[PDB]
Amino acid sequence: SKIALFDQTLIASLLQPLSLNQPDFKAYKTKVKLKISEQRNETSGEKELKFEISRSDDFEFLFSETLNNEKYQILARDHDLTVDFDAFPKVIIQHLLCKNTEINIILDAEKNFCSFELFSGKIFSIKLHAVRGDHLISHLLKICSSQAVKLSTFY
Amino acid sequence: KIALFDQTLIASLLQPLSLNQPDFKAYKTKVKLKISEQRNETSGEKELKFEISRSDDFEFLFSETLNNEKYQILARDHDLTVDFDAFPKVIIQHLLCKNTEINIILDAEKNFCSFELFSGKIFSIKLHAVRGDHLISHLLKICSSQAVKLSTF
């Protein structure tokens, strides 16, 4: 079973490099929908935590990352997070629901990855990968279907 | 990639209903056929892509791309005397004819479908289920075109 712990649209400053041997960047604030869900791994009952970001203005924009205890222990040490893996979603959801929080998404040069941060790299940083294949096919199919609903209601 | 055909045809869609019995749920529908002339990315060899899509079904996507080698098997089966280069000229003409019967026989698992003229006899290509990046783009076109429609309204 996969339980959603967060599903709100946040304001994020979206940074992306554009050149080699020149510091040109594509910077702009945007509405990024963040989805934090709790799941258990199908192979071992081990608790997981999936992070997923999507843009409503960019259908192709899909980046996710799923944490396990092992994966989180590397993260915690790096950003000097004192909390354990179970009490960490409680901490971040609270940190996120705060209007004063700065969500900066630093995108990959080839938009293959994205560093989702809080305030700056040093404060907090998850590296989400590019979602493709069947997981993007479904996400794209949800949009088409939800927009098919919107155009039907349109009278 | 040069498009040689891009019209919406009326096709009788035969959907299977049984296993070990040829019972079908038949209904006419609007199937957009696109025949394009391309060249293989590995070797400059000329290729001919057949692609069917439904406007009423976003997931409905089937393609099949012919090369000379692949066409030589097809030509023998349907006793087509024509060469690979002179064959698109022949089918486009066959298709533009109002009298032609376009029947698409669907796969029980919706993985393939035999696109045929009248029955299999004249012309019958077996198209596979289009997935991956080719469906991603096709789905991205719909989202984008529907994003335009919802902006205007």
Side-chain angles (χ1 to χ4, degrees), chain A residues 19-39:
Chain A
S19 176
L20 316 175
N21 319 328
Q22 243 199 284
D24 317 327
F25 290 86
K26 205 183 224 264
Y28 52 98
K29 293 260 211 192
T30 192
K31 280 175 177 172
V32 172
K33 185 184 66 61
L34 175 63
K35 267 180 87 190
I36 313 157
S37 61
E38 203 181 270
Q39 52 184 57

PDB file of all heavy atoms in Angstrom, chain A residues 19-39:
ATOM      1  N   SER A  19      24.832  26.815 -20.942  1.00  0.00           N
ATOM      2  CA  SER A  19      26.039  26.853 -21.783  1.00  0.00           C
ATOM      3  C   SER A  19      27.302  26.272 -21.138  1.00  0.00           C
ATOM      4  O   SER A  19      27.464  26.294 -19.918  1.00  0.00           O
ATOM      5  CB  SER A  19      26.335  28.301 -22.196  1.00  0.00           C
ATOM      6  OG  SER A  19      27.532  28.492 -22.943  1.00  0.00           O
ATOM      7  N   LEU A  20      28.220  25.799 -22.002  1.00  0.00           N
ATOM      8  CA  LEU A  20      29.563  25.333 -21.661  1.00  0.00           C
ATOM      9  C   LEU A  20      30.507  26.457 -22.069  1.00  0.00           C
ATOM     10  O   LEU A  20      30.400  26.992 -23.192  1.00  0.00           O
ATOM     11  CB  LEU A  20      29.954  23.989 -22.338  1.00  0.00           C
ATOM     12  CG  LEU A  20      28.944  22.826 -22.388  1.00  0.00           C
ATOM     13  CD1 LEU A  20      29.507  21.678 -23.202  1.00  0.00           C
ATOM     14  CD2 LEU A  20      28.536  22.344 -20.979  1.00  0.00           C
ATOM     15  N   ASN A  21      31.395  26.851 -21.137  1.00  0.00           N
ATOM     16  CA  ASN A  21      32.375  27.945 -21.296  1.00  0.00           C
ATOM     17  C   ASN A  21      31.649  29.342 -21.403  1.00  0.00           C
ATOM     18  O   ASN A  21      32.075  30.227 -22.167  1.00  0.00           O
ATOM     19  CB  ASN A  21      33.345  27.698 -22.500  1.00  0.00           C
ATOM     20  CG  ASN A  21      33.852  26.270 -22.658  1.00  0.00           C
ATOM     21  OD1 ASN A  21      34.028  25.520 -21.686  1.00  0.00           O
ATOM     22  ND2 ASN A  21      34.090  25.857 -23.899  1.00  0.00           N
ATOM     23  N   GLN A  22      30.560  29.514 -20.603  1.00  0.00           N
ATOM     24  CA  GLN A  22      29.739  30.723 -20.459  1.00  0.00           C
ATOM     25  C   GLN A  22      28.692  30.512 -19.348  1.00  0.00           C
ATOM     26  O   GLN A  22      27.975  29.508 -19.385  1.00  0.00           O
ATOM     27  CB  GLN A  22      29.074  31.134 -21.773  1.00  0.00           C
ATOM     28  CG  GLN A  22      29.554  32.506 -22.258  1.00  0.00           C
ATOM     29  CD  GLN A  22      28.588  33.105 -23.273  1.00  0.00           C
ATOM     30  OE1 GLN A  22      28.560  32.698 -24.455  1.00  0.00           O
ATOM     31  NE2 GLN A  22      27.736  34.047 -22.832  1.00  0.00           N
ATOM     32  N   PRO A  23      28.587  31.423 -18.342  1.00  0.00           N
ATOM     33  CA  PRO A  23      27.631  31.191 -17.244  1.00  0.00           C
ATOM     34  C   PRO A  23      26.241  31.787 -17.494  1.00  0.00           C
ATOM     35  O   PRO A  23      25.797  32.667 -16.747  1.00  0.00           O
ATOM     36  CB  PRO A  23      28.324  31.839 -16.038  1.00  0.00           C
ATOM     37  CG  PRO A  23      29.278  32.859 -16.616  1.00  0.00           C
ATOM     38  CD  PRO A  23      29.376  32.654 -18.105  1.00  0.00           C
ATOM     39  N   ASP A  24      25.553  31.294 -18.545  1.00  0.00           N
ATOM     40  CA  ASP A  24      24.196  31.706 -18.906  1.00  0.00           C
ATOM     41  C   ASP A  24      23.224  30.752 -18.244  1.00  0.00           C
ATOM     42  O   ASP A  24      23.472  29.558 -18.287  1.00  0.00           O
ATOM     43  CB  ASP A  24      24.005  31.722 -20.434  1.00  0.00           C
ATOM     44  CG  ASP A  24      25.135  32.318 -21.246  1.00  0.00           C
ATOM     45  OD1 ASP A  24      25.795  33.265 -20.749  1.00  0.00           O
ATOM     46  OD2 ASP A  24      25.348  31.858 -22.389  1.00  0.00           O
ATOM     47  N   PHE A  25      22.157  31.246 -17.603  1.00  0.00           N
ATOM     48  CA  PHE A  25      21.207  30.397 -16.881  1.00  0.00           C
ATOM     49  C   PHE A  25      19.785  30.741 -17.141  1.00  0.00           C
ATOM     50  O   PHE A  25      19.465  31.905 -17.252  1.00  0.00           O
ATOM     51  CB  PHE A  25      21.440  30.539 -15.382  1.00  0.00           C
ATOM     52  CG  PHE A  25      22.732  29.932 -14.896  1.00  0.00           C
ATOM     53  CD1 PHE A  25      23.918  30.657 -14.936  1.00  0.00           C
ATOM     54  CD2 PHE A  25      22.761  28.647 -14.365  1.00  0.00           C
ATOM     55  CE1 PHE A  25      25.119  30.090 -14.499  1.00  0.00           C
ATOM     56  CE2 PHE A  25      23.960  28.085 -13.916  1.00  0.00           C
ATOM     57  CZ  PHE A  25      25.130  28.811 -13.986  1.00  0.00           C
ATOM     58  N   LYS A  26      18.904  29.756 -17.172  1.00  0.00           N
ATOM     59  CA  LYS A  26      17.486  30.054 -17.358  1.00  0.00           C
ATOM     60  C   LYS A  26      16.754  30.039 -15.991  1.00  0.00           C
ATOM     61  O   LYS A  26      16.279  28.976 -15.547  1.00  0.00           O
ATOM     62  CB  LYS A  26      16.818  29.095 -18.364  1.00  0.00           C
ATOM     63  CG  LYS A  26      15.592  29.711 -19.031  1.00  0.00           C
ATOM     64  CD  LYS A  26      14.893  28.744 -19.958  1.00  0.00           C
ATOM     65  CE  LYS A  26      14.492  29.357 -21.277  1.00  0.00           C
ATOM     66  NZ  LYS A  26      13.079  29.846 -21.338  1.00  0.00           N
ATOM     67  N   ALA A  27      16.656  31.216 -15.339  1.00  0.00           N
ATOM     68  CA  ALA A  27      16.041  31.336 -14.016  1.00  0.00           C
ATOM     69  C   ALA A  27      14.663  31.947 -14.061  1.00  0.00           C
ATOM     70  O   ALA A  27      14.493  32.965 -14.715  1.00  0.00           O
ATOM     71  CB  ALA A  27      16.924  32.182 -13.130  1.00  0.00           C
ATOM     72  N   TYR A  28      13.693  31.360 -13.319  1.00  0.00           N
ATOM     73  CA  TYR A  28      12.307  31.826 -13.204  1.00  0.00           C
ATOM     74  C   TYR A  28      11.560  31.101 -12.116  1.00  0.00           C
ATOM     75  O   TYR A  28      11.719  29.898 -11.961  1.00  0.00           O
ATOM     76  CB  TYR A  28      11.527  31.681 -14.527  1.00  0.00           C
ATOM     77  CG  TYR A  28      11.589  30.309 -15.158  1.00  0.00           C
ATOM     78  CD1 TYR A  28      10.562  29.394 -14.984  1.00  0.00           C
ATOM     79  CD2 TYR A  28      12.647  29.951 -15.987  1.00  0.00           C
ATOM     80  CE1 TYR A  28      10.609  28.132 -15.570  1.00  0.00           C
ATOM     81  CE2 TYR A  28      12.719  28.683 -16.561  1.00  0.00           C
ATOM     82  CZ  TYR A  28      11.704  27.767 -16.343  1.00  0.00           C
ATOM     83  OH  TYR A  28      11.798  26.514 -16.941  1.00  0.00           O
ATOM     84  N   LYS A  29      10.706  31.821 -11.390  1.00  0.00           N
ATOM     85  CA  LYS A  29       9.839  31.232 -10.363  1.00  0.00           C
ATOM     86  C   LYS A  29       8.691  30.520 -11.064  1.00  0.00           C
ATOM     87  O   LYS A  29       8.305  30.937 -12.165  1.00  0.00           O
ATOM     88  CB  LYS A  29       9.293  32.286  -9.394  1.00  0.00           C
ATOM     89  CG  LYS A  29      10.337  32.944  -8.510  1.00  0.00           C
ATOM     90  CD  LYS A  29      10.357  32.341  -7.119  1.00  0.00           C
ATOM     91  CE  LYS A  29      10.754  33.362  -6.080  1.00  0.00           C
ATOM     92  NZ  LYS A  29      11.069  32.728  -4.763  1.00  0.00           N
ATOM     93  N   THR A  30       8.168  29.430 -10.462  1.00  0.00           N
ATOM     94  CA  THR A  30       7.091  28.653 -11.060  1.00  0.00           C
ATOM     95  C   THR A  30       6.320  27.831 -10.026  1.00  0.00           C
ATOM     96  O   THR A  30       6.739  27.749  -8.878  1.00  0.00           O
ATOM     97  CB  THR A  30       7.636  27.781 -12.168  1.00  0.00           C
ATOM     98  OG1 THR A  30       6.533  27.258 -12.903  1.00  0.00           O
ATOM     99  CG2 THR A  30       8.572  26.671 -11.667  1.00  0.00           C
ATOM    100  N   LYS A  31       5.170  27.263 -10.436  1.00  0.00           N
ATOM    101  CA  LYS A  31       4.318  26.450  -9.583  1.00  0.00           C
ATOM    102  C   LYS A  31       4.680  24.989  -9.792  1.00  0.00           C
ATOM    103  O   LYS A  31       4.410  24.422 -10.851  1.00  0.00           O
ATOM    104  CB  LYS A  31       2.833  26.725  -9.870  1.00  0.00           C
ATOM    105  CG  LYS A  31       2.279  27.997  -9.211  1.00  0.00           C
ATOM    106  CD  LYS A  31       0.822  28.267  -9.649  1.00  0.00           C
ATOM    107  CE  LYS A  31       0.232  29.469  -8.950  1.00  0.00           C
ATOM    108  NZ  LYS A  31      -1.097  29.853  -9.512  1.00  0.00           N
ATOM    109  N   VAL A  32       5.348  24.401  -8.793  1.00  0.00           N
ATOM    110  CA  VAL A  32       5.811  23.009  -8.775  1.00  0.00           C
ATOM    111  C   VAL A  32       4.986  22.230  -7.762  1.00  0.00           C
ATOM    112  O   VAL A  32       5.008  22.569  -6.582  1.00  0.00           O
ATOM    113  CB  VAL A  32       7.322  22.914  -8.471  1.00  0.00           C
ATOM    114  CG1 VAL A  32       7.747  21.474  -8.257  1.00  0.00           C
ATOM    115  CG2 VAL A  32       8.143  23.557  -9.577  1.00  0.00           C
ATOM    116  N   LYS A  33       4.278  21.185  -8.226  1.00  0.00           N
ATOM    117  CA  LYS A  33       3.442  20.324  -7.398  1.00  0.00           C
ATOM    118  C   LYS A  33       4.291  19.206  -6.801  1.00  0.00           C
ATOM    119  O   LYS A  33       4.817  18.365  -7.534  1.00  0.00           O
ATOM    120  CB  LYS A  33       2.275  19.773  -8.226  1.00  0.00           C
ATOM    121  CG  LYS A  33       1.255  18.960  -7.428  1.00  0.00           C
ATOM    122  CD  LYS A  33       0.166  18.340  -8.321  1.00  0.00           C
ATOM    123  CE  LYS A  33       0.641  17.266  -9.313  1.00  0.00           C
ATOM    124  NZ  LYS A  33       1.271  16.052  -8.668  1.00  0.00           N
ATOM    125  N   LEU A  34       4.463  19.229  -5.474  1.00  0.00           N
ATOM    126  CA  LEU A  34       5.257  18.236  -4.764  1.00  0.00           C
ATOM    127  C   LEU A  34       4.357  17.186  -4.121  1.00  0.00           C
ATOM    128  O   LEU A  34       3.375  17.535  -3.466  1.00  0.00           O
ATOM    129  CB  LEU A  34       6.162  18.899  -3.717  1.00  0.00           C
ATOM    130  CG  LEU A  34       6.998  17.990  -2.794  1.00  0.00           C
ATOM    131  CD1 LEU A  34       8.013  17.156  -3.562  1.00  0.00           C
ATOM    132  CD2 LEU A  34       7.745  18.791  -1.785  1.00  0.00           C
ATOM    133  N   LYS A  35       4.708  15.892  -4.326  1.00  0.00           N
ATOM    134  CA  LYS A  35       4.016  14.702  -3.829  1.00  0.00           C
ATOM    135  C   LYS A  35       4.957  13.844  -3.001  1.00  0.00           C
ATOM    136  O   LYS A  35       5.865  13.232  -3.563  1.00  0.00           O
ATOM    137  CB  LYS A  35       3.477  13.862  -5.005  1.00  0.00           C
ATOM    138  CG  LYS A  35       2.040  14.150  -5.422  1.00  0.00           C
ATOM    139  CD  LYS A  35       1.577  13.266  -6.612  1.00  0.00           C
ATOM    140  CE  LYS A  35       0.998  11.921  -6.186  1.00  0.00           C
ATOM    141  NZ  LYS A  35       0.793  10.999  -7.343  1.00  0.00           N
ATOM    142  N   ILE A  36       4.764  13.801  -1.671  1.00  0.00           N
ATOM    143  CA  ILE A  36       5.580  12.953  -0.793  1.00  0.00           C
ATOM    144  C   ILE A  36       4.699  11.775  -0.361  1.00  0.00           C
ATOM    145  O   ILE A  36       3.679  11.987   0.299  1.00  0.00           O
ATOM    146  CB  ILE A  36       6.209  13.695   0.421  1.00  0.00           C
ATOM    147  CG1 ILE A  36       6.862  15.005   0.000  1.00  0.00           C
ATOM    148  CG2 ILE A  36       7.214  12.806   1.141  1.00  0.00           C
ATOM    149  CD1 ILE A  36       7.007  16.014   1.112  1.00  0.00           C
ATOM    150  N   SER A  37       5.060  10.546  -0.760  1.00  0.00           N
ATOM    151  CA  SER A  37       4.273   9.384  -0.381  1.00  0.00           C
ATOM    152  C   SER A  37       5.109   8.361   0.373  1.00  0.00           C
ATOM    153  O   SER A  37       6.317   8.254   0.166  1.00  0.00           O
ATOM    154  CB  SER A  37       3.614   8.751  -1.599  1.00  0.00           C
ATOM    155  OG  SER A  37       4.585   8.320  -2.531  1.00  0.00           O
ATOM    156  N   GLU A  38       4.443   7.635   1.275  1.00  0.00           N
ATOM    157  CA  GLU A  38       5.008   6.584   2.100  1.00  0.00           C
ATOM    158  C   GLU A  38       4.630   5.255   1.521  1.00  0.00           C
ATOM    159  O   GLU A  38       3.451   4.980   1.316  1.00  0.00           O
ATOM    160  CB  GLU A  38       4.495   6.694   3.537  1.00  0.00           C
ATOM    161  CG  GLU A  38       5.411   6.034   4.552  1.00  0.00           C
ATOM    162  CD  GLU A  38       4.906   6.123   5.979  1.00  0.00           C
ATOM    163  OE1 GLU A  38       5.237   7.114   6.676  1.00  0.00           O
ATOM    164  OE2 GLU A  38       4.194   5.184   6.405  1.00  0.00           O
ATOM    165  N   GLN A  39       5.608   4.402   1.304  1.00  0.00           N
ATOM    166  CA  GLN A  39       5.362   3.069   0.764  1.00  0.00           C
ATOM    167  C   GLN A  39       6.257   2.043   1.451  1.00  0.00           C
ATOM    168  O   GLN A  39       7.166   2.414   2.190  1.00  0.00           O
ATOM    169  CB  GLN A  39       5.607   3.073  -0.756  1.00  0.00           C
ATOM    170  CG  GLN A  39       6.958   3.654  -1.142  1.00  0.00           C
ATOM    171  CD  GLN A  39       7.167   3.741  -2.618  1.00  0.00           C
ATOM    172  OE1 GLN A  39       6.386   4.369  -3.337  1.00  0.00           O
ATOM    173  NE2 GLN A  39       8.274   3.187  -3.093  1.00  0.00           N
TER     174      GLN A  39
END
